[PDB]
Amino acid sequence: GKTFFGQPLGLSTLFMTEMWERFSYYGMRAILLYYMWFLISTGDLHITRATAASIMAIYASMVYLSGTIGGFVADRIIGARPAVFWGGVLIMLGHIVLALPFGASALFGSIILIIIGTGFLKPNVSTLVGTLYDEHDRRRDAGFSIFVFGINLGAFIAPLIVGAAQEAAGYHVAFSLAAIGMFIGLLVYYFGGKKTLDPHYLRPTDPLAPEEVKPLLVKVSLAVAGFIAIIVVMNLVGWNSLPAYINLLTIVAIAIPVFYFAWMISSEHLRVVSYIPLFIAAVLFWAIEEQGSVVLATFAAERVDSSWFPVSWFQSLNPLFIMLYTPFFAWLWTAWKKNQPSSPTKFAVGLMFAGLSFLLMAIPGALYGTSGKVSPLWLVGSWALVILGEMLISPVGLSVTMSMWFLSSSVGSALNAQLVTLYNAKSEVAYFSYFGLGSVVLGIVLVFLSKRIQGL
């Protein structure tokens, strides 16, 4: 009888848990770059704005990378329900430390807490949604669609509420609101979950066997030791600026899939090779999409007349278009019975739309010059285009592909950590035109390659 939009009642709990976590996350993302600008302007943070942009990008990269690890830790060590709870606690702490009366000195600690916390929570709330359904339950896709609406809803309202709070009451109060958002999520999660969640998920479902503990320990220890060795050598040869560390994280984030690629190609060999263009297309798409909170956020603050509203509000456009497009594409893929495009073709076209979203942004500077301010509608059109691309590439991404798919966004963001340092008023038009055109061209290349990939 009683449901949450046709689904098991437990979905309401997880819906709200993620909505409020996404609220805390995207509330932070909407103001953190501006916060670093503020800390630079007061002389508390001694970096360039370019490096601040780089930080935003690599932050996102590590959050995504962390997400590829959290499922293992839940499934094999601590359980999905405690992963979500303690992940949320860590996330809340990460916002609290920025709410505290510190300055730049608290930034790194905040970032680490949220990287670890999001890694624990994000994959595992998704897992818990699955546990609501039997294997044979046809409602599963509908349920995840509803869950995703909650995600986007949280992403949508957070810049509005947290961004407004920031401009009125300051950054510390704004970060306190992010923390409170996660707290609300934890309250609903903790008390609601006890009502509907299977007790089974209080513990690992595939706990380490006795003989598995030592090898895992050796694996992790060697990884940490090597990473620390690299940092020691870096400091010895004088490569110890913040950009150097960001470069190290960039290399690590990119080396991970590259090593996977090199592994599989060495160790259906055709299939794996054919994924390379798809994986590259996904990386470049996520790169462009993830620049919304960095380069488009910069354009919004410097190049747009937003005198009458908080410029952080532009970050709401991304989840807004997702919500607006979704029922149309839901309809589209079911109504498109005859000659529906293949997944490789969807990637190509998706990459093209992302390219167009940047080519569009080259136009105001080319037409009006870069010294003035332009209509907010340029950014609206840009987000409209890139999200159109997301609708094509994202729903079939994991399908056509596993971890390397989830890694595509991490790698895209790591690429951004390098690229966004190139963006400024002098380079604006060339930046948008170059990377936009480059993306369209590779989209066109992928179209040429499409039939072969579809065959394999």
Ligand X SMILES: CCCCCCC/C=C/CCCCCC(=O)OC[C@@H](O)CO
Ligand Y SMILES: CCCCCCC/C=C\CCCCCC(=O)OC[C@H](O)CO
The footprint of ligand X on residues 397-436 (CB under 6 A) is 422, 427, 430-431, 433-434
The answer to whether 109 and 72 have CB atoms below 8 angstroms apart is no
**Which amino acid, one-letter code, is at 248?**
L
Give the separation between CA 355 and CA 386, rounded to whole angstroms.
8
* HSE of 392, CA atoms in CB hemisphere, 13 A: 25
The strand ranges marked E within 302-435 are none
- Out of 112, 148, 273, 400, the residue judged to bind ligand Y by CB under 6 A: 112
CB of residue 66 to ligand X, shortest distance in Å: 11
Give the separation between CA 274 and CA 201, rounded to whole angstroms.
38
Q: Which of residues 24-63 bind ligand Y (CB under 6 A)?
A: 55, 58-59, 62
Give the separation between CA 33 and CA 290, rounded to whole angstroms.
13
Distance of CA 282 to the CA centre of its chain: 13
CB of residue 237 to ligand X, shortest distance in Å: 25
The answer to whether 389 and 318 have CB atoms below 8 angstroms apart is no
Contact partner at residue 113 from ligand X, Na ion, ligand Y, none, CB < 5 to 8 Å by partner kind: ligand X
Output 31 or 136, the one with its CB closest to ligand Y: 31
**Closest Cα to residue 182, out of 313, 56, 16, 31?**
16
Give the separation between CA 62 and CA 112, rounded to whole angstroms.
9
DSSP state of 178: H
- Residue 327 sits at the vertex; the CA angle it makes with 159 and 277, to the nearest 5 degrees, is 80
Contact partner at residue 311 from Na ion, ligand X, ligand Y, none, CB < 5 to 8 Å by partner kind: Na ion
59 assigned ligand-binding residue: no
- Out of 16, 125, 294, 317, the residue judged to bind ligand Y by CB under 6 A: 317
Helix, strand, or coil (residue 292): helix
Helix, strand, or coil (residue 241): coil
Q: Which of residues 180-209 bind ligand X (CB under 6 A)?
A: 186-187, 190
Site string for ligand Y, 233-262 (x = CB under 6 A): -x----xxxxxxx-xxx-xx-xxx-xx---
The answer to whether 67 and 406 have CB atoms below 8 angstroms apart is yes
CB of residue 376 to ligand X, shortest distance in Å: 9
**Which amino acid, one-letter code, is at 199?**
P
List all residues 6 or more positions away from 335 whose beta carbon is below 8 Å from its beta carbon. Answer: none
178 binds ligand X (CB under 6 A): no
164 binds ligand X (CB under 6 A): no
Q: Which stretch binds ligand X (CB under 6 A): 32-40, 142-150, 377-385, 448-456?
A: 377-385
What token pair was written down for 311? 């410029």
Q: Which of residues 167-226 bind ligand Y (CB under 6 A)?
A: 170, 172-173, 176, 179-180, 183, 190, 193-194, 197, 202, 207-208, 210, 213, 216-217, 220-221, 224
- Residue 383, Cβ density class (10 Å: 0-12 exposed, 13-18 middle, ≥19 buried): buried
CB of residue 385 to ligand X, shortest distance in Å: 5
The answer to whether 377 and 433 have CB atoms below 8 angstroms apart is no
54 assigned ligand-binding residue: no
306 binds Na ion (CB under 5 A): yes
311 binds Na ion (CB under 5 A): yes
- Out of 24, 293, 413, 450, the residue judged to bind ligand Y by CB under 6 A: 450
Residues touching ligand X, count (CB under 6 A): 35
219 assigned ligand-binding residue: no
DSSP state of 184: H
Q: Which of residues 350-379 bind ligand Y (CB under 6 A)?
A: 356, 359-360, 362-363, 366, 375-377
CB of residue 371 to ligand X, shortest distance in Å: 17
What token pair was written down for 422? 């190139």
Residues 70, 33, 224, 245, Cα dihedral to 10°: 150
352 binds ligand X (CB under 6 A): yes
Q: Which stretch binds ligand X (CB under 6 A): 62-70, 111-119, 228-236, 402-410?
A: 111-119
Q: Which residues bind ligand X (CB under 6 A)?
A: 78-79, 82, 86, 89, 96, 109, 112-113, 116, 186-187, 190, 280, 283, 349, 352, 356, 359-360, 375, 377-378, 381, 384-385, 388, 422, 427, 430-431, 433-434, 437, 440
Which residues sit in the known binding site for L-glutamate? Answer: 22, 26, 409
Q: Which residues are annotated as a binding site?
A: 22, 26, 122, 409
Q: What residues form the annotated binding site for L-glutamine? A: 22, 26, 122, 409
